[PDB]
Amino acid sequence: DLAPALQALSPLLGSWAGRGAGKYPTIRPFEYLEEVVFAHVGKPFLTYTQQTRAVADGKPLHSETGYLRVCRPGCVELVLAHPSGITEIEVGTYSVTGDVIELELSTRADGSIGLAPTAKEVTALDRSYRIDGDELSYSLQMRAVGQPLQDHLAAVLHRQR
């Protein structure tokens, strides 16, 4: 069933929902609801899809989709497409301390960003995830549009039954 390489990350499997917030020097702050699903097809990667929407009415905001590859246990390659015309490969590592998993990834660690002709100029993304039991939280930092690498999105999600 589950590929051996994915065993440490098995607590990610399933559906998660919660709420977060975003900011950047070039935009107004905002908040969002978020739904994520992690699944697999028997190979050494997880599938991942995310949709966010406005807190007030539920209007679609951002989404992302792709794969969390486990090269060899302890190392990850996150490969993502964004509907904003951007692709992202973040590379990094994780650690398990009991029911806590900490994952740290970045495009800056031999990752990649691709920009469609009409996309905004994003040049680096860093992600820090913590899965603690039924709570998943993250912070994402971004370097883009003339601004230095800094906090951009963060959320807390909870495992759905």
Experimental method: X-ray
The CATH class given to the 1-161 domain equals mainly beta
In angstroms, rounded to a whole number, what is the distance separating the alpha carbons of residues 30 and 130?
A: 22
Pairing type for strands 45-54 and 75-82 reads unpaired
Structure tokens at 81: 């497409």
Beta carbons of 8 and 94 less than 8 angstroms apart: yes
In angstroms, rounded to a whole number, what is the distance separating the alpha carbons of residues 88 and 69?
A: 13
**Residue boundaries of the structural domains of the chain:** 1-161
Resolution in A: 1.5
CA distances from 23 to 7, 9, 104, 136, 137 (A): 35, 29, 21, 20, 17
In angstroms, rounded to a whole number, what is the distance separating the alpha carbons of residues 66 and 28?
A: 28
In angstroms, rounded to a whole number, what is the distance separating the alpha carbons of residues 61 and 159?
A: 21
Task: Name the β-bridge partners of 151.
Answer: 141
